[PDB]
Ligand binder design. Structure first.
Ligand SMILES: COC(=O)c1c(-c2ccno2)n[nH]c1C
Ligand SMILES: COC(=O)c1c(-c2ccno2)n[nH]c1C
Ligand SMILES: [Mg+2]
Ligand SMILES: [Mg+2]
Lengths: 208, 208
């Protein structure tokens, strides 16, 4: 059964600015997501140093970029640390609140949207290119969840019955109609090269 | 009683390159250290969301830059999550090993030293400006430690009998003789402005 939650007003605010503002340099969504994955692989790797059994849900620490033209999706998968239900519903909301206010103040000082990751709310750049985002995630301590928002002030969470994923986070981008350049192999390659060349984990770009 | 440890060969290697290479843009040591603190405050803040008693060792999450001309030291203090003894001796060594190899490969491709933080070995940029580094640190789960290295292949760790610090990390830079510009108020201000303007925690610069 699906639970529907309201975003705190400040996150709603941020998701609308990202959606409504004219800002043509949308491609940074991809370095933000890949950074987010890089951060989650670091946390699982570190944890596993003092508790090797934390890697029983999978030994490989890696990033996969999967485009799907027929579904119009670009999916970013990592086998990072994952998100618990509390993360999805309470924790990330709390943190994103003060990063949003800083990111908000910064813009009314002449910062721009590409700097969104310095404020720990990188994830929301997904709304530059996606009309809907679905996040499948599995943490060691909790069940597998599906989270979802087309923005407009609310999100849902359900327990996920799909393919079990071991441990990590899949971020599925349902791309806006004018944004299908990010399904193209040479375009994704160009962005990873330009913005993500030094990520400490293999990034595999799947072909269609 | 003081325990002396050898750095793994790869870290020794990196500490010598940093020390021996001609590279005039030394001021980035400060953004790397302040980033490291920012990362440690984030981890304590997050932990405390699911366990408020983690903040009993101190509620304030903040960065202090303290210069001392008579001691020739610049100290960076945070009240972040801290380092356990295992961190100091085993854990950070393990992580710094593969970040060093990537940072090493990157340079023999025309990357430069300012990019050291993308490889998770930012901390070692301290050796651009300091002949000796001392790190006092307190984690919730362990005792207070003093760690220390003038490089040359070894470091020491002892339990620290000094002023108890609550929780966090003080990084004390014993500056090389030609590097005292970083004791000057207007110089530190210039670097924080230039490289660290958007840190999510108050950074207080102490005067002498
Ligand atoms: C994986 O998605 C996220 O990172 C996320 C966030 C988030 C990440 C950073 N700030 O918020 N909130 N809610 C979700 C599902
Ligand atoms: C606070 O000092 C450090 O961050 C550190 C490190 C370190 C940080 C990042 N890589 O290594 N190793 N050993 C020490 C004492
Ligand atoms: Mg919210
Ligand atoms: Mg070592």
């Amino acid at each position: 059964h699906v639970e529907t939650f309201a975003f705190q007003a400040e996150i709603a605010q941020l998701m609308s600015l990202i959606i409504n503002t004219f800002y043509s340099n949308k491609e940074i969504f991809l370095r933000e997501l890949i950074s987010n994955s890089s951060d989650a692989l670091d946390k699982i790797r570190y944890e596993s140093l003092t508790d090797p059994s934390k890697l029983d849900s999978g030994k490989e620490l890696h990033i996969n970029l999967i485009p799907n033209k027929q579904d119009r999706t670009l999916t970013i998968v990592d086998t990072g640390i994952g998100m618990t239900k509390a993360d999805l519903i309470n924790n990330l909301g709390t943190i994103a609140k003060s990063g949003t206010k800083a990111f908000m103040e910064a813009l009314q000082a002449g910062a721009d949207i590409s700097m969104i990751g310095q404020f720990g709310v990188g994830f929301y750049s997904a709304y530059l290119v996606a009309e809907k985002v679905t996040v499948i995630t599995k943490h060691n301590d909790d069940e597998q969840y599906a989270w979802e928002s087309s923005a407009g002030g609310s999100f849902t969470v359900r327990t996920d019955t799909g393919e079990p994923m071991g441990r990590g986070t899949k971020v599925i981008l349902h791309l806006k109609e004018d944004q299908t350049e990010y399904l193209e192999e040479r375009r994704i390659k160009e962005i990873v090269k330009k913005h993500s060349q030094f990520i400490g984990y293999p990034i595999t770009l799947f072909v269609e």
